[PDB]
Design a protein around this ligand. Structure first.
Ligand SMILES: *C(=S)Nc1ccccc1
Ligand SMILES: *C(=S)Nc1ccccc1
Ligand SMILES: *C(=S)Nc1ccccc1
Lengths: 114, 114, 114
């Protein structure tokens, strides 16, 4: 799986260890090996949520399976919790788009996962 | 909707009020409350369109429904119009990817919209 | 088609000519005139792959059709090859998400491709 967070929170407000914590927590939540988890944090963005420039985030999670109603609710609780506790972003100012990728549509190591 | 614009136009050429204008115009265009709308503008990018580094944009619009042939043509006229007027980007150097998201695949406020 | 690369490799390590090379190589690979090809490279990113911040890349390729098992394997060999040669990123630290877009869901020039 891969997780991207885009936020208007400044770079200096992203704590040491944040990418490592995301990696560990995503491994735990998806049950997948941390070796293949990718994470990407993009601070200092020009963004608004509900017309307001208070702290917010727009995120994506891509996974080959492990995407669905109950799973995505669990991921949202986990990820909004992390964004609130580490970046001080209110959960009601976060969107996360979930993508269930077909293995044939994910490239890696000169080939695909199919 | 959530609207993201990535462009090689520099930050100083993005006019004051642009995020709010995008929010207002998308609210009016989708018939939705502005409290739902998220906007994200990413200037100063290293990009090319047709091999040329003249002003261009790569964009995404995500919505839970309200995505379809006629609706997407209307969004494109609106959004290319704003990019032309405000960022001086030719409409034939803009791509907008439209995504019809399922409510179960959009996280918000510790849960999803399902 | 549109190709986006997000990487932790620094801006100075992206060769002059890289966007033009990507455009030409993708034109040849997708069978499309280069006038339609968009490319976007995002260096200096805060990212990790497998918990490590060694060079890595997270990419996307969007196309109206011409996406599938064998085609995507060929794109992955091409694109991982270029990232390895030009940016010195190991192919096993690259993900490429492939998206088969419907023509009605791609805006361009005040309308869509439908
Ligand atoms: C998870 S091991 N990685 C992943 C899943 C889906 C798309 C890209 C990467
Ligand atoms: C477009 S109104 N944005 C949107 C719709 C539904 C849920 C969240 C955001
Ligand atoms: C290639 S003609 N351009 C393209 C394909 C898919 C989505 C956006 C742009």
């Amino acid at each position: 799986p891969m997780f991207i967070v885009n936020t208007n929170v400044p770079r200096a407000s992203v704590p040491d260890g944040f990418l490592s914590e995301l990696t560990q927590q995503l491994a735990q939540a998806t049950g997948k090996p941390p070796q293949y988890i990718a994470v990407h944090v993009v601070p200092d963005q020009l963004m608004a949520f509900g017309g307001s420039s208070e702290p917010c985030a727009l995120c994506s999670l891509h996974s080959i399976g492990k995407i669905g109603g109950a799973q995505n609710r669990s991921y949202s609780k986990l990820l909004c919790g992390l964004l609130a506790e580490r970046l001080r972003i209110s959960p009601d100012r976060v969107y996360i788009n979930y993508y269930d990728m077909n293995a044939a549509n994910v490239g890696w190591n000169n080939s695909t996962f199919a």
